Amino acid sequence: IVEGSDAEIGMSPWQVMLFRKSPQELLCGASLISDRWVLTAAHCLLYPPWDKNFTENDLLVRIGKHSRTRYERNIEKISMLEKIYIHPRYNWRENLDRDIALMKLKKPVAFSDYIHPVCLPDRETAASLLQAGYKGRVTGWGNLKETGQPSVLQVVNLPIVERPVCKDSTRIRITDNMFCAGYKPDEGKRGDACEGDSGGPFVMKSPFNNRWYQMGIVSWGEGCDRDGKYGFYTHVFRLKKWIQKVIDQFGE
């Protein structure tokens, strides 16, 4: 996160760390949606151009963490994965369209003050919240700068941007499965995800039932917090059907 702040403790209890067994490193962010399912970006697991193609045993998922580097001995839980599901039409060849995967934990995790699943948006929730000018929140342990690494979890609140602006800021083909968010060069506030925040949640709090919903997944960007450039996120609602379909296809 570029130009964020340290999250408070238990501020984002669904925030998952995707961790490499060996070398022992942060892969990406992720999110807990039930007691057995974690949502992330497919580009965290599979990116054939950078030779990235992770399997179930290459990976560990650490939930409840606050510190990026410390083993938070009695607060975080570290789980094993049984299976990884990538959207069958994740386009890594061109624009990371449908950048979404599901990970099934080997065992259900126990909810705690620090662990708790985020909700997935329903059509009606998607429809009234996903609107230009409304702010969402991104969290992660990613780089602080495009060009170091936080100690603690970082948060930043960003506006959703109009589709036309998104599009005219890049040369890349933007699909309906994406939204972009960030301040304009003119707004006088900045912030953005960055490498290592990838796969994390963009969430919004419903003003109607006071719940937190995950509207987007940290997907891609051109730099980190570059003027006239925006963060792009997978549109979780548009891919909901897929999400349901696999959890019921084997879950869940």
Partner: peptide, 25 residues
């Protein structure tokens, strides 16, 4: 039970910048 944070919503405590989200809606 999704999206209600044990240390915030469940005790009716707000986090330091959630109202920035709310003011934008």
């Amino acid at each position: 039970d999704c999206g209600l944070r044990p240390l915030f919503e469940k005790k009716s405590l707000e986090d330091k910048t959630e109202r920035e989200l709310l003011e934008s809606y």
